[PDB]
């Protein structure tokens, strides 16, 4: 009616106001300051391990806390806890829901969690006393598949689902304590700030919001992508994040100036992006593509500095150790390779 | 290295006890065929054989199958459908229902088309039934449901080149069962790339025996796989 007409026009006045402030702060791009930094040159790095033993494709992995162990979950319904230095399987946990889409590894080295199309999320008691790894809790309450998990500490998860909402449980009793709403599309990923008081999330409809753990809120809302968002992470300083959509571009947003700074485009790339992560010192940016490659972008004046090509199918996940000596990359042919 | 000798000798049993079980559970995984089940609308969820995935299991002449009925999800399939690019076949069920409550065929031709031309589902083969023939036979001779109103080329469509399977097959039904078939195969024979097939059928006119009709045509899908790797075919 008249009010829905005015409300659809009231918003436009607010939105048109917001752009003016953003375009009143830009006085030079990041690519004009860093035209004097000495270019890195070129770097080469070659595989140093190869872990075999899976039967199907791989959707997840998470480096341990001491950068020694790691976890990997596949679609044949089986979790495995490798050892990076000498290639020894230390555990092999069988599941009951064959469709597993994520996993996570506790910061205290004590817990492992995973969930998939079956809506429930399970948490596993690892360093038991009796000597048999079984299900500790079973967190139900979503409506739709579940596509990411993280821990804050022991007994507090923050999770993302497929019905356009996030949740924040507590393992001791099993029931939620908060619920975040405001995404009109499926939610695909999240990451936690390096002080554990915020977390940015990415969703289809091409938006990335900035929430607040203490009370559900939507401090910021960044936009500028051209298609849905697949993977996201923070700059190690906690003062920027980078994200990758399905249009073959990465971007480097900002949490203070509240806009976009610079973009990573190359003419010969027509494939999406499935994972993004930073380096330990924040000078490189390892990106994983669906051209089977894994480029390496200089992150203060965009231009490549190498390639990491060893796979035959797509790259479905990658990470970097906490201290930083290795880059494990999973793939849809069941092989993980510990680059260096 | 007086003690690390013991530990490295201690972990090498935890690597063999695991690897012995992980090999006994590689034969079982290779002896079962997985079968998805996409159903458009309300026709067919347990008719052939009688939250989350709702598995069901059966066996024909000592061969076992698994069937996934994806229920209690939202109707946005462009994210959880690319998880199923590994199954043997994709069973498929359509039915000519009423449009009073929009379009029960033209909303299925555009879904079957999307599974065919997907960049990741380029190596899986559909097995589609054409459900609810005892409903159509009581509507076509009654006139309530028509295909000329929705599909123009039906009135100027020819006669099939095959024969009736049953006594009591009027031109009205035969023109109906055999026009839709030629509307699905107009799609199935236009994809240049990929290596996959399509096996039509008819159902619901007779007592369902589809535990055989899926067994007889899930053998055809693997035979044509071994031939093409020896390059003999």
């Amino acid at each position: 009616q008249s009010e829905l007409d005015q409300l659809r026009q009231e918003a436009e006045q607010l939105k048109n106001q917001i752009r003016d402030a953003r375009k009143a702060c830009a006085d030079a791009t990041l690519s004009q300051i860093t035209n004097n930094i000495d270019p890195v040159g070129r770097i080469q790095m070659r595989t140093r391990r190869t872990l075999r033993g899976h039967l199907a494709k791989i959707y997840a992995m998470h480096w341990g806390t001491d950068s020694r162990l790691l976890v990997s979950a596949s679609q044949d319904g089986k979790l495995i806890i490798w050892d990076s230095y000498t290639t020894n399987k230390v555990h092999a946990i069988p599941l009951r829901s064959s469709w597993v889409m994520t996993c996570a590894y506790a910061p205290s080295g004590n817990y492992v969690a995973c969930g998939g199309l079956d809506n429930i999320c399970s948490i596993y008691n690892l360093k038991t006393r009796e000597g048999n790894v079984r299900v500790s809790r079973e967190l139900a309450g979503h409506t739709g598949y579940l596509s990411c998990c993280r821990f804050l500490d022991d007994n507090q998860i923050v999770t993302s689902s497929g019905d356009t909402t996030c949740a924040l449980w507590d393992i001791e009793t099993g029931q939620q304590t908060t619920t975040f709403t405001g995404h009109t599309g499926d939610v695909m990923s999240l990451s936690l700030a390096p002080d554990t008081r915020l977390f940015v999330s990415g969703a289809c409809d091409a938006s990335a919001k900035l929430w607040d753990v203490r009370e559900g809120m939507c401090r910021q809302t960044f936009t500028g992508h051209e298609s849905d968002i697949n993977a996201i992470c923070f700059f190690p300083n906690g003062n920027a994040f980078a994200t990758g959509s399905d249009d073959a571009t990465c971007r480097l947003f900002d949490l203070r100036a509240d806009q976009e700074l610079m973009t990573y485009s190359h003419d010969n790339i027509i494939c999406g992006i499935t994972s993004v992560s930073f380096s330990k010192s924040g000078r490189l940016l390892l990106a994983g593509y669906d051209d089977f490659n894994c480029n390496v972008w200089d992150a203060l004046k965009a231009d490549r500095a190498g390639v990491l090509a060893g796979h035959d199918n797509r790259v479905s996940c990658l990470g970097v150790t906490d201290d930083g000596m290795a880059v494990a990359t999973g793939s849809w042919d069941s092989f993980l390779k510990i680059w260096n | 290295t007086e003690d690390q000798r013991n530990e490295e000798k201690a972990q090498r049993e935890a690597n063999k006890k695991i690897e012995k079980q992980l090999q006994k559970d590689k034969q079982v995984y290779r002896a079962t065929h997985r079968l998805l089940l996409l159903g458009a609308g309300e026709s067919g969820k347990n008719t052939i054989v009688k939250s989350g995935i709702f598995e069901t299991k059966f066996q024909v002449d000592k061969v076992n199958f698994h069937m996934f009925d994806v229920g209690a999800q939202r109707d946005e399939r462009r994210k959880w459908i690319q998880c199923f690019n590994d199954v043997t076949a994709i069973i498929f069920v359509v039915a000519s229902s009423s449009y009073n409550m929009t379009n029960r065929l033209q909303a299925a031709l555009k879904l079957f088309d999307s599974i065919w031309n997907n960049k990741w589902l380029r190596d899986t083969s559909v097995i589609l039934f054409l459900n609810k023939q005892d409903l159509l036979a009581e509507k076509v001779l009654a006139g309530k449901s028509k295909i000329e109103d929705y599909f123009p080329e039906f009135a100027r469509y020819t006669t099939p080149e095959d024969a009736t399977p049953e006594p009591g097959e009027d031109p009205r039904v035969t023109r109906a069962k055999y026009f839709i078939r030629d509307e699905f195969l107009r799609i199935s024979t236009a994809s240049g790339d990929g290596r996959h097939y399509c096996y039509p059928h008819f159902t619901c006119a007779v007592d369902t025996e589809n535990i055989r009709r899926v067994f007889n045509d899930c053998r055809d899908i693997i035979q044509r796989m071994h031939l093409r790797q020896y390059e003999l075919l």
Epitope: D205, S227 | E76, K119
Partner: nanobody, 128 residues
Framework: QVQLQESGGGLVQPGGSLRLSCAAS????????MNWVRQAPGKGLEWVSD????????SYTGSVKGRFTISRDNAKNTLYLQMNSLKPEDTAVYYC?????????????????????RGQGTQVTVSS
């Protein structure tokens, strides 16, 4: 961000014509397919037409072939329709729905739930 807003609808007696339009802003318009979608009053959404990326692969619906027409212009970022003779049944709202991904052949945009990348639509009415 993406902005799709349609204009051109109105009111016409049976036997008349009507011309619609569409507008794109925030992406490269010459990379994706496009479509049109209609919603009967108190009914779910149905498919109407489409057009390919360059303008050489058109399709229609079994109830409309011969009466409508779809065409686009890359260098100005616009896309039109063309209705010629309207029955009393051609009364609904019409949206301008883009396809999810670039450099593809396939789309998944009919869903009654919330779906981004889709305009607000114009109203058309027909009666004596």
């Amino acid at each position: 961000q993406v902005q799709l807003q349609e204009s051109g609808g109105g009111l016409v007696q049976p036997g008349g014509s009507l011309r619609l339009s569409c507008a794109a802003s925030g992406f490269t318009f010459s990379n994706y397919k496009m479509n049109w979608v209609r919603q009967a009053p108190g009914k779910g959404l149905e498919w109407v037409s489409d057009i390919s990326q360059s303008g050489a692969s058109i399709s229609y619906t079994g109830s409309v072939k011969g009466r409508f027409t779809i065409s686009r212009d890359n260098a100005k970022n616009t896309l039109y329709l063309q209705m010629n003779s309207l029955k009393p049944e051609d009364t609904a709202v019409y949206y301008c729905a883009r396809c999810p991904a670039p450099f593809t052949r396939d789309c998944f945009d009919v869903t009654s739930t919330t779906y981004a990348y889709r305009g607000q639509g114009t109203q058309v009415t027909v009666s004596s």
